[PDB]
Amino acid sequence: MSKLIVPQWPLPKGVAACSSTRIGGVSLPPYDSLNLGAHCGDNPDHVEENRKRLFAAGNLPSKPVWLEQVHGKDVLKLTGEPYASKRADASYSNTPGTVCAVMTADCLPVLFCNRAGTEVAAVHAGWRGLCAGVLEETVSCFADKPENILAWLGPAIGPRAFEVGAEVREAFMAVDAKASAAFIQHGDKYLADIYQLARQRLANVGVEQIFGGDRCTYTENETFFSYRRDKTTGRMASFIWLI
Amino acid sequence: MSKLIVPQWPLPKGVAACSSTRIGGVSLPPYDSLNLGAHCGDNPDHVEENRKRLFAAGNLPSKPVWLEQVHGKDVLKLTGEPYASKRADASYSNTPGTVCAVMTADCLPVLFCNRAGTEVAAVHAGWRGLCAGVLEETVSCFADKPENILAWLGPAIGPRAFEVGAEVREAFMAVDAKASAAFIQHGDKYLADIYQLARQRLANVGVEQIFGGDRCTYTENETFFSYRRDKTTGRMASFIWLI
Ligand SMILES: [Zn+2]
Ligand SMILES: [Zn+2]
Numbered sequence A, B: 001m002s003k004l005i006v007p008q009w010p011l012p013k014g015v016a017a018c019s020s021t022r023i024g025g026v027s028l029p030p031y032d033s034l035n036l037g038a039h040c041g042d043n044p045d046h047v048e049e050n051r052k053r054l055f056a057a058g059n060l061p062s063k064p065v066w067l068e069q070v071h072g073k074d075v076l077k078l079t080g081e082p083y084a085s086k087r088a089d090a091s092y093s094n095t096p097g098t099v100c101a102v103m104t105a106d107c108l109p110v111l112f113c114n115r116a117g118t119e120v121a122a123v124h125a126g127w128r129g130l131c132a133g134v135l136e137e138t139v140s141c142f143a144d145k146p147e148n149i150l151a152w153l154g155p156a157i158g159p160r161a162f163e164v165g166a167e168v169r170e171a172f173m174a175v176d177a178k179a180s181a182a183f184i185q186h187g188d189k190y191l192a193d194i195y196q197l198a199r200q201r202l203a204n205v206g207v208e209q210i211f212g213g214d215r216c217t218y219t220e221n222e223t224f225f226s227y228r229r230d231k232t233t234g235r236m237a238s239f240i241w242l243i
Helices: A044-058 A127-131 A134-139 A165-175 A177-182 A196-205 B044-057 B127-131 B134-139 B166-175 B194-204
Strands: A013-021 A075-077 A090-093 A100-102 A106-112 A121-125 A149-153 A183-186 A189-192 A209-211 A236-242 B015-019 B075-077 B090-093 B100-103 B110-115 B120-125 B149-153 B184-187 B189-192 B207-212 B236-242
Touching: A013 A044, A013 A106, A044 B075, A075 A134, A090 A100, A090 A134, A090 A177, A100 B166, A106 A134, A106 A236, A121 A127, A121 A134, A121 A236, A127 A134, A127 A165, A127 A196, A127 A209, A127 B127, A134 A196, A134 B236, A149 A196, A165 A189, A177 A196, A183 B075, A196 A209, A209 B189, A236 B075, B015 B110, B075 B134, B090 B100, B090 B134, B110 B134, B110 B194, B110 B236, B120 B134, B120 B236, B127 B166, B134 B194, B149 B194, B166 B189
Parallel strands: A075 A090, A100 A121, A149 A209, B075 B090, B100 B120, B149 B207
Antiparallel strands: A013 A236, A090 A121, A100 A236, A106 A121, A106 A149, A183 A189, B015 B236, B090 B120, B100 B236, B110 B120, B110 B149, B184 B189
C-alpha cells in the first residue's frame, strides 16, 4: 500500500521519476511508515524493508546512488559505480538504468531532465546550497540547452512554515536582490518561499519549464516527514533516471 | 456576530472557557467569517480582526499563548514568557490571567481544569499525539488528582467522517486492544471515534468527569472549518483560563 507521488509534467518517453511519502512502510514512530533514511535513528532492518518496498513500487531499474548530502552545492556525475567521494547534494546522469536520488525531509527536492530524455539530474536544495547556486551548477552539467530542460519541484516545507532568520533573507538578496519577493515578514523573521526562490534562479538560467511546488512537508503531516516539525523523524526521497 | 460555543460542563468558580466557530468573522472564502489561524494563507488583517472580535466575545483577560502545534504530544507549562521553546500541542497554567489556547480544524480540542478552579489546560490532540498519549501527559501536569479533573471535548471530525487507514487502528490497538471499539470498517479503512479514544485514555488515568464530544467539524460545515473537508480553510480555537 506504498503511496508514491508521480511528478505532474510532460515526462519524456525514456524518463521515469518518483517521489516518496511517509506511507506504506514498516517503521514505527517517530519514523512511522516509509522511512528511507539510514541516519536518523530508525530500526536498520525496517529502513531496508522500506527501501526494498519503494524500489519495487517505483520500478527502479537498479539501486539509487545515494549521495553523502552535506547541504553544499556540489553535483556528482554518475559516470560509474567506482567513485571516490559521493559527498555532494546533487547527481547527474546520462546513463540508462542509473538512478539519481536525493534524500529529504523539508529541503527542496528538484528533478531535472531534457525533453529528448537523454539526461537526468536530481538535487537536494536546502537554503544554503540553493543560495550558493546548486541548481545553477546542476543545470550547467547538462549538455542540452536550458530551453530544453524540465524542472520538477518536489515536496518541501512551504511558504507558510519555512520560517527563517534575517540573515537567510539578506544572504539571498546579496546575490539577486529580486529574492526580496520570496520573503514575507513574520516577527523578527520571515516566511520564505523556497519554490519562488528556485524559480528565480531557474529563470536566471533559462529553464522556462517548471512544475510541482504545490506541497508542504510541514503542513501535510499525514503524508510527509518534516525535520522542522518533528526534529527526530523519517526521510522521503525523490528519484529520476533514464529508462 | 462571533457566535461563541460555551462548554456545557460544571464550570468552576475562577475558571472561564470558550471555543470558536467559523461564523461572525471578517474573512472571505475559503475561510469565510472567523478564521483564527495565521498560517493558512488568509489575509492577516482579517485574521487580526477575527482574533480581536473573539477575544472580546470570549472576554479573555489577555491574548492567548499560541503554541507551535506540531502534532506531537508535548505539554508546555506557562509560568513565564521567556520560554525555551513554544513547540507543543498542549499547555497548562495555574497562573490567573494566562490564556491556554489550541488552534484546530478537525483535530480533537480538549480543555482541562480542576474542580477547585486553580488549574487549567488546553490540548490539541491529533491522532498521533493522542495515540502517543498527549492527554495522559497533560493530566500528569496537574498537581490535583484526576478525580477532581474536568475534561471537555471540543468540536472535532466525528465518527462518521474521520476515516483512517489500517495503520491508525493498529497503532491504537497496539497501545490498548480496547481501542478496537472506536473503529468501524469502511472499505479498506475504518471510521474512528476520536472522542471514544479520548475517553478511554482519560479513563485509564482516572478522569471520571468528561463532557462534550457531540459535535463534528466535518459534518456541520456551516459552523466549523474542516481540514479533511476543505483543503485550504480557516481554523477555530478553544480557550480556557483562570480568572
Ligand atoms: Zn536538507
Ligand atoms: Zn491538528
